[PDB]
Design an enzyme around this catalytic site. Structure first.
Site, PDB file in Angstrom:
ATOM      1  N   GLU A  65      37.398  42.237  35.278  1.00 35.60           N
ATOM      2  CA  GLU A  65      37.051  41.001  35.968  1.00 35.60           C
ATOM      3  C   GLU A  65      35.725  40.441  35.476  1.00 35.60           C
ATOM      4  O   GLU A  65      35.620  39.243  35.193  1.00 35.60           O
ATOM      5  CB  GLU A  65      36.999  41.244  37.477  1.00 35.60           C
ATOM      6  CG  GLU A  65      38.351  41.485  38.122  1.00 35.60           C
ATOM      7  CD  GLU A  65      38.237  42.056  39.522  1.00 35.60           C
ATOM      8  OE1 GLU A  65      38.116  43.292  39.653  1.00 35.60           O
ATOM      9  OE2 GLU A  65      38.265  41.269  40.492  1.00 35.60           O
TER      10      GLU A  65
ATOM     11  N   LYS B 101      54.445  37.366  35.863  1.00 39.21           N
ATOM     12  CA  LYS B 101      53.161  37.118  36.508  1.00 39.21           C
ATOM     13  C   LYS B 101      52.510  35.851  35.973  1.00 39.21           C
ATOM     14  O   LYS B 101      51.901  35.096  36.739  1.00 39.21           O
ATOM     15  CB  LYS B 101      52.232  38.319  36.327  1.00 39.21           C
ATOM     16  CG  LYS B 101      50.905  38.202  37.069  1.00 39.21           C
ATOM     17  CD  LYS B 101      51.115  38.109  38.573  1.00 39.21           C
ATOM     18  CE  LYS B 101      49.848  38.456  39.339  1.00 39.21           C
ATOM     19  NZ  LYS B 101      49.557  37.459  40.406  1.00 39.21           N
TER      20      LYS B 101
END
Ligand SMILES: [Mn+2]
Ligand SMILES: [Zn+2]
Ligand SMILES: [Zn+2]
Lengths: 1402, 49
Positions: free
Chosen positions: A51, A115
């Site tokens: 992230e 996704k």
RNA sequence: CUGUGCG
């Protein structure tokens, strides 16, 4: 147990990067002792590393507090209603601009794309929600296929993964937590994963029931003699019932007289009778407004310069007064027009009380004067300027602003020849005294009879290109109308000066939609008015000579007939009339009519045709212009195929086949997408409602009633009562008989025929995630649109498994040629052999191959084959079972139109079948959203299995015919269409017993109908011509199909980079020369493409197209060879010396001193020096200073054109047509070229900078090749515009050397230049050094050996290093593109007369 | 025996045919093609007479 | 936040 934990804690303590939040997560990680929580905290650490890497790479603020969108909007004071709750990875605020980031990692490509698309969908939903509150958002998605990052080293991370896996070796975590589902998901997320049988097989009794349905009644274990006995008795019964009359015959003997009499009587209720050519030319030249405009006998520029200048500065928005800015522009153009008209010039951009202002819009003089007077009055109300100083001041202000806006971009406003003296002190008065008092321009929707036409309708003889010239100008006017911006008289207007006049195409509606145009003239007012679709008039934009030349060729094919010489001029007139009719009125119905003409002429020169051929040829015509086309076709066939010709039938057949293939000139796009989408849905649905399985809303968790209906329809699909029934066989009915399926399977068995997203479980309906949901779309075709069943990535993988299995099965056999080019070539050779011997050839097409086929049919034919050498086949069976229970999403536009029609019928007429279906569904409340049915093989999704089924079924049918008659039948299929080549016995049978032969063909038809192989009415049983894969063979030769390739060349113009466009057109023209097209017509096609590029004001380079070829550079020449020939034609002196030095170098390289090892390094220095260095190293005289300064303007020198670092490392990474041309002209007019300082500029700025130099000369050869000779004194001296120029001799040497490496050493030789019905099928003789196995060949090794950094970024001894070296540094072409992007052409069928007029070289 | 026995310009005649250099023609076709030129419009060689 | 380019 804790030893690995302690060691890995040591490793993550020593190898971890120094961070402050990572240290917090670390201190939260090292404090725990439970191994499951260690796993969770380790995966959390990895996720946080991912992230923060994404956040620092994207420059966005990290969202660690799990703040949703509402939290971000509330922390800034923006109150929004209840919207979607989405927590992103990162957010970035810049005023009213939010940048959102979501990151994820997936190991499998299917889950990755799942996704990706769900994230894309939710991001678009959030965008739509945020636009309702007026907040601009931009999406960003970070899908990572790997677990790598930039904080922990790779090998220690792999060791962490391995130790986490080794801690999953225990079982305490397995029975404490991590249930089987979650444990399997986690183990797959940590794993690194063609069948994947490790699935939770919970197939219920429905699978076994359907499998038993494929077995009961079917034997599939009969004897090779028992099957022959059954086939013989069935043929006896069928022939008896045929001779009696119980079974209707489908094949009629071809009577040319009767066939022509049936074609002429088409549309007998709407067409009167036979029409002469004179009456046709009379009614044609005045048929429709566009055709009335043609054949009409219709007999500096300061305004234009000012209009262009103001059109350039209207997009830069020099003032936030859009209406007032437009007013200032109108006033400036009025002043320019007056200054132009007082000196000497007449009214050019005028139409009468209306002038063509900026943004190509008509503005009225009265409204302009009124608005200008109001503006100046209001400006004078505030305070002296005497009503003229204020206007002069504001004009000076706007002109200064525009010149400054054109100065920083380098336009050099003096390039427009403005002659800024139109701004007089008495400007306002000069505008107010302006009085033209002309004719009022209008549109006049729904006009009247031709007698209200201004000019003389019909004077142009159909022998000059003036009609084609007017059609080209008008088509270009429409395509330019397509690009109007329409900001804020209101009608817009384009201009097309034809001769001594300048017509104006007026139109009020904007965009590429179908609108209503009005051709007006200044002298007579409105001339014509027509409702046209602009995006369809492309193929005639500049082909004034291309069309005349294809007409001339088609006419010269039959000119030496000695029996049409009295009607040759009429045939030429009819051909040109048909061409101009299909080009000036491009309609889908005319295209369908010409295709039906193709089928008719294919069935005209044969022995037997289908009784329902004329029913298929006759297609509904409207608009009274399509009827004119039908009358023209009828007259042309009456003249060419008269009763008293009987001479060179080959030439006349080829001529009419090309007249039919003229349908490709009409664009293959849809006129209106809604109606054609509804038509595609009709084609998809009608077989289902006629069969009886239209289950709606499949309810993914399948109900027992749905499965019961499915198995009932599966049993119904296998009934197909044959000829042994009472009534007889019902032809064209979907379903396969148990008897014939058993016969096929039995004869194949014995040696007689060939002799949170991943799916966890799966049942008989689908893998617990979706029963293969497909989406139905239409694919553009010329005659009629095709179907497309587009599926998600998982369905794509499943269909790929099935298709690979069945493609292997087909490759094990040797009959089918669909994806096997060797088998297609063998089929073509056998077809030539069978046609040249006048053996009977059966060109079969299969009507409704998609909608009538069945995945259950393939499953049944699979369950009954043995495949002697069970896993692998059980997976194939359950995949086909999934395909049976398949959902197809009805297009939202179709269901919306049906709902609107239902509302209109319930509020406010022989409704169709699909309409009644939708209405009966709407009346009970349900909306049709998916149609699960058994009778649907996807159009393409099951292409390989359908091809295998066609192969085995045609093999069985030919075996049956041979065992019941005594004659072999070769077969070659393409899964939709096939050809059956009969031997000498069947041909002699037809010659001696036509009744028995037609009975055999009726038996073939009935047997094919006993499978799902309904033989289409387009089928043809002829011993002369044979068609297969749109390949027509007459007497062992091949029909050129010239018009098909000519239209494909005039159509394919994309909006991509101009050199790629040139490569595409060159490949199309290469195919055209290969098949039938003469060299002059292809030169004209290339000239047409160059004119298309010149209209975009593009600086035509020598490396674009060679429009002076002589059928020697196509047969045995690459595109590089054609460009080299062009450069040789440019500089016949320096290129001679370069060819001499290259000949010596090739001689010393192939069999001489080793030079290739250091030539790779020599090709990386400065070209100017390296030229003389090489010429001295070889001893040849170097090029002179004058014959070396030649260069070409390479706009893509620093960076490629931004059509909204070498290029070879980028080509291996692998709207409409009129909109494509519009985009090409818009991009090549906007800031497309990029500079060295990463700044964009216009091409006009580059021409200005070139003219801002005393060296360049700009000498073009004959058609605008536009090669320069910038001297060497200023060559890259102080970073001038010369950086865009590239030396021409260096590029020529590179290209000639690469071509010599490609195709022989004869290319370096000095070029010694030395009835349209003869052809010579020769081959591209070339001892190539680029063997066709080069898809990912050693080229990548050379790339990595020479360019390592380029091998890392944007990516992932043999005589090949030079091929890769001569394009990474010599950026002229790719020089390797027909092996990895394009494909080579062989077996060139070119005119033999044009081979003797060619050039030669040692 | 050079290919099939048909009039290469008709596709219809199978009886009373003359022989070209490499194929056959019909009598009507021979009298009709000799009116334009001596060269065969199929194999590009003079027609026998 | 765009092209003015066919005699
Ligand atoms: Mn076919
Ligand atoms: Zn004949
Ligand atoms: Zn001959």
């Amino acid at each position: 147990m804790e030893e690995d934990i302690a060691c890995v804690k040591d490793l993550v303590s020593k190898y971890l990067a120094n961070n402050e939040r990572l240290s917090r997560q670390k201190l939260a990680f090292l404090v725990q002792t439970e191994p499951r929580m260690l796993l969770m905290e380790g995966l959390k650490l990895l996720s946080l590393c991912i992230e923060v890497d994404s956040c620092n790479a994207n420059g966005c603020e990290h969202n660690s507090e799990d703040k949703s969108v509402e939290r971000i909007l509330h922390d800034h004071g923006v109150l929004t209603p209840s919207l979607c709750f989405v927590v992103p990875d990162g957010y970035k605020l810049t005023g009213n601009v939010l940048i959102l980031l979501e990151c994820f990692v997936r190991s499998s490509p299917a889950n990755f794309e799942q996704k990706y698309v769900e994230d894309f969908k939710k991001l678009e939903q959030l965008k739509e929600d945020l636009k309702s509150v007026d907040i601009n958002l931009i999406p960003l998605i970070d899908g990572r296929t790997s677990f790598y990052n930039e904080q922990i080293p790779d090998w220690v991370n792999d060791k962490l993964r391995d130790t986490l896996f080794s801690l999953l070796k225990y079982a305490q975590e397995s029975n404490s937590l991590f249930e089987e589902s979650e444990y399997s998901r986690l183990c797959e997320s940590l794993s690194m994963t063609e069948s994947l049988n490790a699935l939770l097989d919970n197939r219920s009794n429905h699978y076994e029931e359907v499998i038993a349905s494929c077995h009961q009644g079917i034997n599939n274990k009969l004897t090779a003699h028992e099957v022959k006995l059954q086939i013989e008795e069935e043929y006896q019964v069928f022939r008896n019932r045929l001779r009696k009359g119980e079974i209707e015959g489908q094949f009629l003997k071809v009577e040319k007289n009767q066939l022509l009499n049936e074609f002429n009587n088409l549309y007998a209720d709407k067409v009167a009778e036979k029409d002469s050519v004179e009456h046709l030319t009379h009614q044609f030249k005045r048929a429709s407004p566009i055709l009335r405009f043609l054949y009409a006998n219709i007999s500096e520029c300061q305004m234009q310069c000012w209009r262009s200048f103001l059109n350039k500065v209207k997009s830069m928005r020099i003032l936030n007064t859009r209406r007032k800015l437009l007013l200032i522009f109108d006033a400036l153009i009025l002043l320019a027009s007056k200054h132009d008209q007082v000196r000497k010039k007449p009214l050019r951009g005028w139409l009468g009380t209306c002038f063509v202002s900026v943004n190509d819009r008509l503005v009225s003089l009265e409204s302009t004067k009124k608005d200008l007077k109001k503006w100046v009055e209001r400006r004078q109300q505030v305070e002296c300027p005497s009503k003229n100083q204020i206007l002069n001041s504001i004009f000076q202000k706007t002109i200064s602003k525009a010149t400054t806006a054109l100065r920083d971009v380098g336009i050099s406003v003096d390039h427009y020849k403005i002659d800024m003296e139109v701004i007089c002190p008495d400007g306002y008065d000069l505008i107010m005294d302006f009085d033209v008092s002309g004719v009022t321009p209008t549109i006049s929707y729904q006009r009247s009879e031709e007698e209200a036409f201004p000019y003389i309708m019909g004077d142009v003889d159909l022998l000059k290109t003036t009609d084609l010239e007017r059609l080209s100008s008008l088509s270009l006017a429409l395509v330019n109308s397509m690009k109007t911006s329409s900001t804020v008289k209101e009608a817009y207007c384009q201009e097309f000066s034809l001769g001594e006049t300048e017509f104006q195409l007026i139109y009020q509606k904007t965009g590429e939609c179908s609108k209503c145009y009005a051709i007006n003239d200044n002298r007579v007012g409105e001339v014509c008015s027509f409702y046209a679709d602009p995006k369809r008039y492309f193929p005639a934009i500049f082909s004034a000579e291309v069309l005349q030349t294809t007409v001339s060729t088609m006419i010269s094919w039959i000119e030496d007939c000695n029996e049409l010489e009295e009607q040759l001029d009429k045939i030429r007139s009819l051909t040109k009339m048909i061409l101009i009719l299909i080009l000036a009125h491009p309609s889908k119905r005319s295209q369908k009519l010409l295709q039906n003409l193709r089928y008719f002429i294919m069935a005209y020169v044969s022995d037997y045709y289908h009784k329902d051929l004329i029913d298929k040829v006759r297609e509904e015509l409207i608009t009274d212009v399509e009827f004119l086309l039908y009358r023209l076709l009828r007259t042309l066939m009456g003249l060419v195929l008269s009763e008293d010709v009987k001479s060179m039938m080959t030439n006349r057949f080829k001529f009419i086949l090309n007249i039919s293939y003229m349908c490709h000139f009409i664009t293959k796009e849809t006129p209106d997408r809604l109606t054609d989408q509804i038509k595609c849905f009709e084609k998809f649905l009608e077989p289902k409602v006629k069969f009886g399985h239209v289950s709606i809303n499949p309810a993914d968790t399948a109900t027992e009633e749905e499965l019961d209906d499915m198995v009932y329809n599966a049993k119904k699909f296998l009934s197909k009562g044959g000829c042994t029934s009472a009534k007889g066989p019902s032809y064209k009915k979907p379903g396969v008989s148990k008897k014939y399926l058993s016969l096929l399977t039995s004869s194949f068995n014995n040696g007689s025929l060939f002799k949170q997203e991943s799916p966890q479980s799966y049942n008989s309906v689908g893998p617990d995630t979706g029963r293969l949901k497909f989406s139905l779309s239409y694919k553009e075709q010329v005659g009629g649109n095709r179907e497309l069943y587009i599926g998600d990535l998982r369905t794509k993988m499943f269909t790929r498994l099935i298709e690979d299995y069945f493609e292997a099965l087909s490759s094990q056999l040797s009959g089918s040629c669909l994806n096997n080019e060797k088998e297609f070539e063998n089929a073509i050779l056998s077809m030539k052999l069978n046609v040249s011997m006048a053996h009977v050839s059966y060109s079969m097409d299969h009507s409704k191959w998609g909608p009538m086929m069945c995945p259950f049919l393939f499953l049944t034919v699979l369950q009954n084959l043995i495949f002697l050498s069970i896993k692998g086949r059980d997976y194939l069976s359950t995949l086909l079972m999934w395909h049976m229970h398949k959902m197809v999403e009805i297009p939202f536009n179709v269901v919306s139109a049906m709902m609107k029609s239902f509302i209109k019928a319930q509020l406010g007429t022989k409704q169709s079948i699909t309409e009644d279906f939708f209405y009966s569904n709407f009346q009970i409340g349900v909306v049709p959203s998916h149609i699960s049915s058994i009778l649907d093989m996807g159009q393409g999704i099951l292409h390989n299995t359908s091809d295998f089924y066609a192969l085995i079924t045609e093999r069985f049918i030919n075996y049956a015919i041979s065992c019941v008659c005594g004659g072999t039948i070769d077969a070659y299929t393409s899964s939709d269409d096939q050809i059956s080549l009969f031997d000498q016995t069947l041909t002699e049978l037809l010659h001696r017993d036509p009744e028995e032969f037609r009975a055999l063909m009726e038996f073939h038809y009935y047997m094919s109908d006993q499978l799902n192989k309904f033989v289409s009415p387009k089928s043809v049983i002829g011993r002369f011509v044979a068609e297969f894969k749109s390949r027509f063979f007459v007497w062992g030769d091949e029909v050129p199909l010239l018009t098909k390739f000519v239209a494909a060349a005039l159509h394919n113009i994309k909006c991509k980079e101009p050199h790629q466009l040139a490569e595409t057109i060159d490949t199309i023209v290469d195919q055209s020369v290969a098949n039938g097209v003469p060299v002059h017509l292809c030169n004209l096609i290339q000239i047409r493409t160059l004119s298309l590029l010149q209209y975009a004001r593009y600086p035509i380079d020598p490396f674009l197209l060679n429009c002076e070829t002589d059928v020697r550079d196509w047969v045995d020449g690459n595109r590089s060879y054609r460009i080299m020939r062009q450069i040789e034609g440019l500089i016949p002196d320096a290129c001679s010396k370069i060819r001499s030095m290259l000949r010596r170098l090739y001689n010393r390289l192939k069999t001489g001193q080793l030079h290739e090892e250091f030539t790779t390094n020599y090709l990386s220095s400065e070209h100017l020096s390296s030229l003389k260095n090489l010429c001295e190293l070889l001893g040849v005289e170097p090029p002179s200073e004058s014959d070396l300064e030649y260069s070409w303007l390479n706009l893509a020198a620093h960076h490629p054109l931004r059509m909204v670092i070498p290029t070879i490392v980028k080509t291996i990474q692998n709207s409409s047509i009129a909109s494509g041309f519009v985009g090409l002209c818009r991009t090549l007019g906007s800031k497309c070229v990029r500079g060295p300082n990463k700044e964009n500029l216009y091409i006009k700025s580059i021409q200005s900078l070139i003219t801002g130099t005393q060296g360049i000369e700009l000498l073009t050869n004959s058609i605008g090749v536009q090669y320069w000779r910038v001297p060497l004194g200023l060559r890259n001296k102080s970073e001038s515009v010369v950086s865009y120029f590239r030396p021409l001799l260096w590029d020529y040497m590179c290209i000639s050397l690469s071509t010599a490496i490609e195709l022989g050493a004869w290319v370096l030789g000095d070029p010694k230049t030395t009835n349209p019905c003869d052809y010579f099928p020769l081959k591209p003789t070339a001892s190539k050094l680029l063997e066709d196995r080069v898809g990912l060949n050693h080229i990548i090794h050379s790339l990595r050996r020479l360019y390592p950094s380029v091998f890392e970024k944007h990516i992932l001894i043999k005589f090949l290093d030079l091929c890769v070296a001569l394009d990474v540094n010599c950026e002229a072409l790719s020089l390797v593109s027909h092996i990895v992007k394009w494909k080579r052409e062989e077996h060139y069928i070119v005119l033999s007369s044009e081979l003797r007029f060619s050039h030669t070289r040692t | 025996h050079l290919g099939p026995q048909f009039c290469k310009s008709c596709w219809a005649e199978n009886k009373g045919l003359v022989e070209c250099n490499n194929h056959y023609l019909c009598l009507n076709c021979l009298t009709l093609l000799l009116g334009v030129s001596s060269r065969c419009p199929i194999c590009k060689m003079p027609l026998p007479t």
